[PDB]
Design an enzyme around this catalytic site. Structure first.
Site, PDB file in Angstrom:
ATOM      1  N   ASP A 180       0.844  -1.177   0.000  1.00  0.00           N
ATOM      2  CA  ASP A 180       0.000   0.000   0.000  1.00  0.00           C
ATOM      3  C   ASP A 180       0.890   1.241   0.000  1.00  0.00           C
ATOM      4  O   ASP A 180       1.889   1.283   0.741  1.00  0.00           O
ATOM      5  CB  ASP A 180      -0.945   0.005   1.194  1.00  0.00           C
ATOM      6  CG  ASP A 180      -2.113   0.958   0.981  1.00  0.00           C
ATOM      7  OD1 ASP A 180      -2.112   1.629  -0.078  1.00  0.00           O
ATOM      8  OD2 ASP A 180      -3.023   0.998   1.840  1.00  0.00           O
ATOM      9  N   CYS A 214      -7.512  -2.145  -5.844  1.00  0.00           N
ATOM     10  CA  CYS A 214      -6.573  -2.405  -4.794  1.00  0.00           C
ATOM     11  C   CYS A 214      -7.458  -2.208  -3.557  1.00  0.00           C
ATOM     12  O   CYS A 214      -8.537  -2.808  -3.474  1.00  0.00           O
ATOM     13  CB  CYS A 214      -5.351  -1.471  -4.903  1.00  0.00           C
ATOM     14  SG  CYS A 214      -5.779   0.248  -5.404  1.00  0.00           S
ATOM     15  N   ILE A 218      -7.382   3.448  -6.373  1.00  0.00           N
ATOM     16  CA  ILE A 218      -6.834   4.669  -6.958  1.00  0.00           C
ATOM     17  C   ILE A 218      -5.311   4.610  -7.081  1.00  0.00           C
ATOM     18  O   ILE A 218      -4.764   4.974  -8.132  1.00  0.00           O
ATOM     19  CB  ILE A 218      -7.395   5.953  -6.242  1.00  0.00           C
ATOM     20  CG1 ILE A 218      -6.997   6.048  -4.745  1.00  0.00           C
ATOM     21  CG2 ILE A 218      -8.924   6.032  -6.432  1.00  0.00           C
ATOM     22  CD1 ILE A 218      -7.424   7.430  -4.104  1.00  0.00           C
ATOM     23  N   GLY A 219      -4.592   4.145  -6.059  1.00  0.00           N
ATOM     24  CA  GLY A 219      -3.128   4.342  -6.159  1.00  0.00           C
ATOM     25  C   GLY A 219      -2.425   3.272  -6.991  1.00  0.00           C
ATOM     26  O   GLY A 219      -1.865   3.527  -8.084  1.00  0.00           O
ATOM     27  N   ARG A 220      -2.443   2.059  -6.438  1.00  0.00           N
ATOM     28  CA  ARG A 220      -1.905   0.882  -7.127  1.00  0.00           C
ATOM     29  C   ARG A 220      -2.690   0.630  -8.427  1.00  0.00           C
ATOM     30  O   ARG A 220      -2.062   0.428  -9.458  1.00  0.00           O
ATOM     31  CB  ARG A 220      -1.887  -0.362  -6.212  1.00  0.00           C
ATOM     32  CG  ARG A 220      -0.775  -0.292  -5.160  1.00  0.00           C
ATOM     33  CD  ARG A 220      -0.915  -1.293  -4.033  1.00  0.00           C
ATOM     34  NE  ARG A 220      -2.042  -1.018  -3.134  1.00  0.00           N
ATOM     35  CZ  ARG A 220      -2.367  -1.784  -2.081  1.00  0.00           C
ATOM     36  NH1 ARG A 220      -1.652  -2.880  -1.771  1.00  0.00           N
ATOM     37  NH2 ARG A 220      -3.414  -1.440  -1.331  1.00  0.00           N
ATOM     38  N   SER A 221      -4.027   0.614  -8.386  1.00  0.00           N
ATOM     39  CA  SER A 221      -4.897   0.603  -9.559  1.00  0.00           C
ATOM     40  C   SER A 221      -4.599   1.655 -10.631  1.00  0.00           C
ATOM     41  O   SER A 221      -4.536   1.285 -11.806  1.00  0.00           O
ATOM     42  CB  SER A 221      -6.380   0.683  -9.141  1.00  0.00           C
ATOM     43  OG  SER A 221      -6.682  -0.460  -8.335  1.00  0.00           O
ATOM     44  N   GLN A 261      -0.996   7.575  -6.190  1.00  0.00           N
ATOM     45  CA  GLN A 261      -1.186   8.189  -4.889  1.00  0.00           C
ATOM     46  C   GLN A 261       0.119   8.746  -4.315  1.00  0.00           C
ATOM     47  O   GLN A 261       0.092   9.414  -3.285  1.00  0.00           O
ATOM     48  CB  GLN A 261      -1.848   7.172  -3.963  1.00  0.00           C
ATOM     49  CG  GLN A 261      -3.378   7.204  -4.000  1.00  0.00           C
ATOM     50  CD  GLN A 261      -3.933   8.488  -3.417  1.00  0.00           C
ATOM     51  OE1 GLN A 261      -3.923   8.637  -2.197  1.00  0.00           O
ATOM     52  NE2 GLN A 261      -4.397   9.432  -4.260  1.00  0.00           N
TER      53      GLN A 261
HETATM   54  C1  LIG Z   1      -3.370   7.738   4.097  1.00  0.00           C
HETATM   55  N1  LIG Z   1      -4.531   6.859   3.979  1.00  0.00           N
HETATM   56  C2  LIG Z   1      -5.663   7.071   3.289  1.00  0.00           C
HETATM   57  O1  LIG Z   1      -5.809   8.103   2.660  1.00  0.00           O
HETATM   58  C3  LIG Z   1      -6.809   6.090   3.227  1.00  0.00           C
HETATM   59  C4  LIG Z   1      -7.464   6.172   1.850  1.00  0.00           C
HETATM   60  C5  LIG Z   1      -6.595   5.406   0.880  1.00  0.00           C
HETATM   61  C6  LIG Z   1      -6.541   5.868  -0.430  1.00  0.00           C
HETATM   62  C7  LIG Z   1      -5.729   5.146  -1.305  1.00  0.00           C
HETATM   63  C8  LIG Z   1      -5.022   4.007  -0.898  1.00  0.00           C
HETATM   64  N2  LIG Z   1      -4.222   3.331  -1.756  1.00  0.00           N
HETATM   65  S1  LIG Z   1      -4.620   2.219  -2.847  1.00  0.00           S
HETATM   66  O2  LIG Z   1      -5.582   2.988  -3.684  1.00  0.00           O
HETATM   67  O3  LIG Z   1      -5.145   1.104  -2.005  1.00  0.00           O
HETATM   68  O4  LIG Z   1      -3.230   1.994  -3.410  1.00  0.00           O
HETATM   69  C9  LIG Z   1      -5.071   3.539   0.407  1.00  0.00           C
HETATM   70  C10 LIG Z   1      -5.865   4.277   1.280  1.00  0.00           C
HETATM   71  C11 LIG Z   1      -5.868   3.763   2.708  1.00  0.00           C
HETATM   72  N3  LIG Z   1      -6.476   4.719   3.649  1.00  0.00           N
HETATM   73  C12 LIG Z   1      -6.778   4.388   4.914  1.00  0.00           C
HETATM   74  O5  LIG Z   1      -6.553   3.266   5.377  1.00  0.00           O
HETATM   75  O6  LIG Z   1      -7.436   5.395   5.752  1.00  0.00           O
HETATM   76  C13 LIG Z   1      -8.570   4.901   6.485  1.00  0.00           C
HETATM   77  C14 LIG Z   1      -9.918   5.221   5.876  1.00  0.00           C
HETATM   78  C15 LIG Z   1      -8.616   3.391   6.697  1.00  0.00           C
HETATM   79  C16 LIG Z   1      -8.645   5.575   7.837  1.00  0.00           C
HETATM   80 CL   LIG Z   2       1.023  -2.872   2.567  1.00  0.00          CL
HETATM   81 CL   LIG Z   3      -4.345  12.747  -5.349  1.00  0.00          CL
END
Ligand SMILES: CNC(=O)[C@H]1Cc2ccc(NS(=O)(=O)O)cc2CN1C(=O)OC(C)(C)C
Ligand SMILES: [Cl-]
Ligand SMILES: [Cl-]
Ligand SMILES: [Cl-]
Ligand SMILES: [Cl-]
Ligand SMILES: [Cl-]
Ligand SMILES: [Mg+2]
Length: 297
Positions: A180, A214, A218-221, A261
């Protein structure tokens, strides 16, 4: 030209600033449906929503909402559905969306548990003999087989519309080693897996759009879809120099917020594309070399 640009950005050390400029320039469209009170429990992340213009609509009456966006790349002529990891209450909607959109492949770039927390529901069966029934959506899902490699697993799933008894084969491409907010271990491991998705036929325009997720979708996707579309674009034209990576990412961002991301996922995107261009322009051999470097056995 991407490689000239890449070294320049690396030399000046300005990935952060390049990346922030994309965020500043990115489209801002409404997500009124995602934000309705009734859909709160259909969203994994408060600040990650599908724009209304591009959202995938479930074909209920009832509540058509799923956190999923159609990224329709007009010039590349490829579409992708990007979605969050399904929640315990949205796994039936997730398979309903796959069925109605006629997807043949689902690409999953996360693990169910990351950093001690549940980032995705266990939405597919892990054992042949224990199939899943999504009674809400009248679907049944059965693991047919799996091929487990060192850092990704490909599964063959059979999805059945119980209302009609029609069945479809869905291929599930699960990348299990992409952290992540992180980058794959190398361009080679990411590209070996991307070309496995391509080779399966799941991206053919005879099928519905591949489903990519993912955790947030958004990020990995975004990284996976950006690398793919960039390579498709130069493949169509046979012309690596005609691809502008940042413009492609901004175009995809018209369809879903937040795609890529971190500045290092951006920089990784250029790495993957620069490397995959060797293949596209006729260097056959690099595909075996990726497979070796990836250590998939
Ligand atoms: C920094 N963290 C965040 O912005 C949020 C949104 C996100 C947006 C994108 C993301 N990455 S991916 O799209 O899975 O690669 C992971 C997260 C995980 N998050 C979280 O775990 O935050 C929560 C909602 C669980 C508190
Ligand atoms: Cl991870
Ligand atoms: Cl962004
Ligand atoms: Cl997992
Ligand atoms: Cl963990
Ligand atoms: Cl979950
Ligand atoms: Mg068994």
């Amino acid at each position: 030209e991407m490689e000239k640009e890449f070294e320049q950005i690396d030399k000046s050390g300005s990935w952060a600033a390049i990346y922030q400029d994309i965020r500043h320039e990115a489209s801002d469209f409404p997500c009124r449906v995602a934000k309705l009170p009734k859909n709160k429990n259909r969203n994994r992340y408060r600040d990650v929503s599908p724009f209304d213009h591009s959202r995938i609509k479930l074909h209920q009456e009832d509540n058509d909402y799923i956190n999923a966006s159609l990224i329709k790349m007009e010039e590349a002529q490829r579409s992708y559905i990007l979605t969050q990891g399904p929640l315990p209450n949205t796994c039936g909607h997730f398979w309903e969306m796959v069925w109605e959109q006629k997807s043949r492949g689902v690409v999953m770039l996360n693990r169910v548990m990351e950093k001690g927390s549940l980032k995705c529901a266990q939405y597919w069966p892990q054992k042949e003999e224990k199939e899943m029934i999504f009674e809400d959506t009248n679907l049944k899902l059965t693991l047919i087989s799996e091929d487990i490699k060192s850092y990704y697993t490909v599964r063959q799933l059979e999805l059945e519309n119980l209302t009609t008894q029609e069945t479809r084969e869905i291929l599930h491409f699960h990348y299990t080693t992409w952290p992540d907010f992180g980058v794959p271990e190398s361009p080679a491991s990411f590209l070996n897996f991307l070309f496995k998705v391509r080779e399966s036929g799941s991206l053919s325009p005879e099928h519905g759009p591949v489903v990519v997720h993912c955790s947030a979708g958004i990020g990995r996707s975004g990284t996976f879809c950006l690398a793919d579309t960039c390579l498709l674009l130069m493949d169509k034209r046979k012309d690596p120099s005609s691809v502008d990576i940042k413009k492609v990412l901004l175009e995809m961002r018209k369809f879903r917020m937040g795609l890529i991301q971190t500045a290092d996922q951006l920089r990784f995107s250029y790495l993957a594309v620069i490397e995959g261009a060797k293949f596209i322009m006729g260097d056959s051999s690099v595909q075996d070399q990726w497979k070796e470097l990836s250590h998939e056995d």
